[PDB]
Design an enzyme around this catalytic site. Sequence first.
Site, PDB file in Angstrom:
ATOM      1  N   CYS A 158      -3.779  -0.794  -3.383  1.00  0.00           N
ATOM      2  CA  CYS A 158      -4.459  -1.681  -2.405  1.00  0.00           C
ATOM      3  C   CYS A 158      -3.698  -1.611  -1.070  1.00  0.00           C
ATOM      4  O   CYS A 158      -2.478  -1.508  -1.089  1.00  0.00           O
ATOM      5  CB  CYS A 158      -4.631  -3.095  -2.950  1.00  0.00           C
ATOM      6  SG  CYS A 158      -5.769  -3.065  -4.365  1.00  0.00           S
TER       7      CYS A 158
ATOM      8  N   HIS B  88      -5.126 -10.594  -0.382  1.00  0.00           N
ATOM      9  CA  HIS B  88      -4.883 -10.927  -1.807  1.00  0.00           C
ATOM     10  C   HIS B  88      -3.424 -10.616  -2.171  1.00  0.00           C
ATOM     11  O   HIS B  88      -3.019 -10.965  -3.314  1.00  0.00           O
ATOM     12  CB  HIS B  88      -5.934 -10.289  -2.717  1.00  0.00           C
ATOM     13  CG  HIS B  88      -5.767  -8.832  -2.972  1.00  0.00           C
ATOM     14  ND1 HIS B  88      -6.800  -7.941  -2.789  1.00  0.00           N
ATOM     15  CD2 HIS B  88      -4.716  -8.113  -3.420  1.00  0.00           C
ATOM     16  CE1 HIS B  88      -6.404  -6.736  -3.133  1.00  0.00           C
ATOM     17  NE2 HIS B  88      -5.128  -6.809  -3.511  1.00  0.00           N
TER      18      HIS B  88
ATOM     19  N   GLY C 208      -1.459  -1.094  -7.340  1.00  0.00           N
ATOM     20  CA  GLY C 208      -0.434  -0.794  -6.323  1.00  0.00           C
ATOM     21  C   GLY C 208      -0.999  -0.034  -5.138  1.00  0.00           C
ATOM     22  O   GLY C 208      -0.281   0.043  -4.108  1.00  0.00           O
TER      23      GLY C 208
HETATM   24  C1  LIG Z   1      -4.855  -3.971  -5.648  1.00  0.00           C
HETATM   25  C2  LIG Z   1      -3.369  -3.658  -5.765  1.00  0.00           C
HETATM   26  O1  LIG Z   1      -2.954  -2.528  -5.533  1.00  0.00           O
HETATM   27  N1  LIG Z   1      -2.523  -4.635  -6.162  1.00  0.00           N
HETATM   28  C3  LIG Z   1      -2.908  -5.994  -6.546  1.00  0.00           C
HETATM   29  C4  LIG Z   1      -2.498  -6.254  -7.971  1.00  0.00           C
HETATM   30  N2  LIG Z   1      -1.046  -6.057  -8.105  1.00  0.00           N
HETATM   31  S1  LIG Z   1      -0.334  -6.696  -9.430  1.00  0.00           S
HETATM   32  O2  LIG Z   1      -0.972  -7.950  -9.689  1.00  0.00           O
HETATM   33  O3  LIG Z   1       1.077  -6.654  -9.214  1.00  0.00           O
HETATM   34  C5  LIG Z   1      -0.669  -5.646 -10.783  1.00  0.00           C
HETATM   35  C6  LIG Z   1       0.085  -4.571 -11.184  1.00  0.00           C
HETATM   36  C7  LIG Z   1      -0.474  -3.968 -12.339  1.00  0.00           C
HETATM   37  C8  LIG Z   1      -1.556  -4.628 -12.812  1.00  0.00           C
HETATM   38  S2  LIG Z   1      -2.052  -5.880 -11.768  1.00  0.00           S
HETATM   39  C9  LIG Z   1      -0.623  -4.706  -7.693  1.00  0.00           C
HETATM   40  C10 LIG Z   1      -1.077  -4.447  -6.278  1.00  0.00           C
END
Ligand SMILES: *CC(=O)N1CCN(S(=O)(=O)c2cccs2)CC1
Lengths: 304, 304
Positions: B145, B41, B143
């Site tokens: 993930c 993702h 952040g």
């Molecule tokens: C799951 C994860 O750590 N992620 C995916 C979502 N992004 S993002 O879309 O840049 C977001 C940042 C803050 C809210 S959503 C970060 C990394």
Amino acid sequence: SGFRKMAFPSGKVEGCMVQVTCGTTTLNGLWLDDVVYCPRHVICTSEDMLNPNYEDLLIRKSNHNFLVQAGNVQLRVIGHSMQNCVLKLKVDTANPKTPKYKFVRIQPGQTFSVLACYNGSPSGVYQCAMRPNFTIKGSFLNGSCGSVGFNIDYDCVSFCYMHHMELPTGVHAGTDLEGNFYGPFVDRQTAQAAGTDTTITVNVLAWLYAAVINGDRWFLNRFTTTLNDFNLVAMKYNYEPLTQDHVDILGPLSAQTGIAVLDMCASLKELLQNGMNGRTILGSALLEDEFTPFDVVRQCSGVT
Amino acid sequence: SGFRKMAFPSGKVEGCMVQVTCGTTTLNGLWLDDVVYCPRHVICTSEDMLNPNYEDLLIRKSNHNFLVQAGNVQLRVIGHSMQNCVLKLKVDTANPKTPKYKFVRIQPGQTFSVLACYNGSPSGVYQCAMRPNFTIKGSFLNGSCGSVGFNIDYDCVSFCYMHHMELPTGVHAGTDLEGNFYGPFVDRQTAQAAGTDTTITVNVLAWLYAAVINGDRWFLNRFTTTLNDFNLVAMKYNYEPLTQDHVDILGPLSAQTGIAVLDMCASLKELLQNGMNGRTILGSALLEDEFTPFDVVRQCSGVT
Ligand SMILES: *CC(=O)N1CCN(S(=O)(=O)c2cccs2)CC1
Ligand SMILES: *CC(=O)N1CCN(S(=O)(=O)c2cccs2)CC1
């Protein structure tokens, strides 16, 4: 989301752990620059531990009696001195993995990570607090002495604890890295009773804020209180008195949640008086007191 | 003495964490040999996340669109492939700090350490269990993930988890390191409800043994039970059924304490039926289920 009892990453401290042997006693040392720090009771037979005279015992020890092993390589000891209840062993090699570091003496209520070690080898990491009676509630078997407690600020490890003792009640006593015991404890196998283990009020409030931030809200009530009124209730429940310094420290969590500190105090007061009625807060059936306001902000904001 | 919720030392895994950026999405990757593993993702806009077609999205991506940073040095991506819900980025440099490692898919009830990371930088370590509904109760902000779960056997890191998702209920879902989700979860911002979070009976029993070993004995009673009788009570309290496999697994703790597993079952049965009556066991007011029998033996014997 979610809120966990979280230790610092231990890698920087793993790189500092060595094995110290004096005679038939093996425990852990901390290797920073060209000094290995360890509990002075390394020089004792468990017989000596009944009434050790450390200065007298140390006379009979030479640099070559201290066997220092970093992984599977021996370090050459070129000097030794006693500072309070720790030995400093000067070695001919600087630890190549020495992180940026400080020695800090923490206050009761302050939290820290412990890297439990046996024979200079890390076995696990967990989060502790310095209890208001200057004990910690650790996990320490024979061989774990010289295991250290620490905080990290980005790149700088602040060492605050070295493990020395289990009290007869199975709680733990140790020193800062200048060899000074937290509390009235001595490195002697004698009668040492801990005082009242009171609850760290400001930490409970920090954790109630963490619960609200993380969606656990059932305990929020319609009441407020005053520091004086709250403190009468705290006294009765062996909670530490709450000061304006604590209220100031909780300011940021107050701001983020829009819950006045004294309102959250009134919530805590009802929880003390009414109990949890079989409910939980962040997966706990008791009020957690081993997260500082700083810990809560760190974990809820994601500092690395 | 003492018994703590204890994570593996994280150093070996700290040395594997990198930052992966695809477009404006940054998360964490695991660098082992010349492969960086991360959640697929990473290629999504949070718009894409509503109904992503990952194969179609991936077509629009080249090796040079994946920005891989290890500390403050960029790695050159020479290949990329999708395996289930993870991307494998081939880099031109083997991670010099690659530990001995395996990828294992754990069973529900199995515990593991999580190294929470942001921008490829470790922020903390905590202990988890794979819940019987294939969720974990983590601490994960945006952040985080690509943060991984692991066990260590002396020198060999077994990676069992990579973080992908927070469910609307603030519990966590993720994959093994082959990119296969634990449970029925999908990397899509859709309605996903967890099943019953049942209590891991064999883990509660392991922790009751740890309590006896560590001097907490008040809950030991004069009763025994049978697996069938115990299981009627477990069913009623949303505890996992206890099997002979679980009884066999608790054998060593049985031996050490001289308490028959079925006697400890009868003790657990009374605790379910009568509650704790405001008492605690190893500092907990509820029955802890995130220590395996293996964890209890490890911590009580001091394995490094
Ligand atoms: C799951 C994860 O750590 N992620 C995916 C979502 N992004 S993002 O879309 O840049 C977001 C940042 C803050 C809210 S959503 C970060 C990394
Ligand atoms: C505190 C510590 O870790 N120590 C000091 C005691 N020794 S020992 O005397 O060798 C013992 C080993 C088992 C029982 S006492 C171990 C290191």
